[model samples]
Target: MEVFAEYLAEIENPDHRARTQEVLTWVAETFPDLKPEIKWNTPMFTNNGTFIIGFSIAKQHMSVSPEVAGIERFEADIKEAGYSHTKGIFRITWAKSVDYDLLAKIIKFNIQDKANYTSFWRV
Candidate 1:
């Protein structure tokens, strides 16, 4: 919680703050090995210093980004989960429930796929 304490505290909307905190807490608790940090004013997780996933807040939804590669890898499942996405990120609209299963799959895929990657991003 303290990892993103300031970010969450700065949010003016109570619902958004709670929702974002829920997601962040789940990620932190589920993947204890993933380092949490604030970059670009967003909360993100990293593994062995490589980026794994990140989240941000917007008016309509909470954005989840796990690199363009992960987004492409999970495109089908993402659509199946009823979330719309672009090449770089996906949206979980304020009214919709989060699909933790899909988020887990994406993060697992990233950990395995980038096991040998040294660069922060795919090059």
Candidate 2:
């Protein structure tokens, strides 16, 4: 987990800032023990080992996903909420109330269900 207060401090977009904070806040609450680090210039959430998910404050979109397998199962609900591509892995371009809530569920479930570390998918 990396501290990125400086990067967050430098963000000029208020909406982006708010959503970033909101997403991080929700993640912190959902997984209270998650350590925050800046990986790939994004806010990466992790525990004792690897990161389960990440939050990216992009120029045109905000990305929130489980960052693992099985997320494709939520594609339908995600698409109905106006996300661009929810298949393969869940990536939401916009995070509304429902989107945010749904993502939290995905994040928590993915972490708790992490049976192995090497592969996110199983045969």
Candidate 3:
């Protein structure tokens, strides 16, 4: 299995692991062209060598980072979708429904937002 797959498989909590795996699978399927990788101890997706989004599993929730630009553009919509978020990351507890539509939009926005970015991170 891939490193990221292994990472998900190792989650101690069965529910968390299952949900996290589902999210990751959804991400992969949504953007089959994006590269899946393990970076900074998290599962991340990248496009053209730039970071598009990243996800990590915690005891209670799955946190997604779409970078500051993506978050800024979609923060209101994300909150309106009934999720909690900080500046650049959002959390969806294991019990909550995963908003795949919102996440897909964020990923799409991130792709365009960083199209000219030469590095994996923002300048």
**Per-residue lDDT of 23-94 in model 3, one digit per residue for the tens?**
888888889989989987889998989999999888788899998788889989989988899987989987
Instruction: Say which candidate scores most in TM-score.
Output: 1
lDDT scores in order: 0.92, 0.64, 0.86
- Give a tens-digit lDDT track for model 2, residues 1-123: 127677677778887777777777777777787777787676777655655777666676776655536356566667777776644444444344536667766677666766345652333
Model 2: residues >4 Å from true position, as ranges? Answer: 68-70, 86-98, 116-123
Q: After superposition, how far is residue 80 of candidate 2 from its true place, in Å?
A: 1.8
Q: Between candidates 1 and 2, name the one with more favorable lDDT.
A: 1
Q: Please provide TM-scores, in order, for all candidate models, with all chains considered together.
A: 0.96, 0.75, 0.94
Model 1: CA > 4 A from native: none
Sorted on TM-score, best first, the list reads: 1, 3, 2
Model 2 TM-score, 2 decimals: 0.75
Backbone clashes in model 3, listed as residue pairs: none
Tell me, what's the RMSD of every candidate? 0.9, 3.3, 1.2
**For model 2, what is the error of residue 5's alpha carbon versus the real structure, in angstroms, after optimal superposition?**
0.8
